[PDB]
């Protein structure tokens, strides 16, 4: 249920996670019904309620929920721009 990754940024004023997340520190935000993310001065807690990408062969990619339009995206550890292999999404 949800997860939390320790702030790896050595700058006490930023927030980064996986290979797609990466923005300056500001505060804690929580969508009304799409995604949830908080920036703890000691760690970062983020959760996802939207459907989860399935049929995705767990080879070496990462899953990220785009709170911009409530959608599920997937990038690659060595390609923070190109989407990895996807198939669909299930509740």
UniProtKB/Swiss-Prot annotation:
Disulfide bonds join 2-47, 15-39, 34-70, 37-46, 61-84. Keywords: Disulfide bond, Pyrrolidone carboxylic acid, Secreted, Signal. The keyword Protein transport does not apply. The modification Pyrrolidone carboxylic acid is found at residue 1. It is found in: Secreted. The keyword Disulfide bond applies. Corpora lutea, mostly in the luteal cells surrounding blood vessels. GO terms for cellular component: extracellular region. It comes from the Eukaryota. Belongs to the beta-microseminoprotein family. Homodimer; Interacts with PI16. This is Beta-microseminoprotein. The chain holds residues 21 to 111 of 111 of the full protein.
């Amino acid at each position: 249920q949800c997860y939390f990754i320790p702030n790896q940024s050595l700058k006490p004023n930023e927030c980064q996670d996986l290979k797609g997340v990466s923005h300056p520190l500001n505060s804690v935000w929580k969508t009304k019904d799409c995604e949830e993310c908080t920036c703890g001065q000691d760690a970062i807690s983020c959760c996802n309620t939207a459907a989860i990408p399935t049929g995705y062969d767990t080879n070496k990619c990462q899953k990220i929920l785009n709170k911009k339009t409530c959608t599920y995206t997937v990038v690659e550890k060595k390609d923070p721009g190109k989407t990895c292999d996807v198939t669909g999404w299930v509740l």
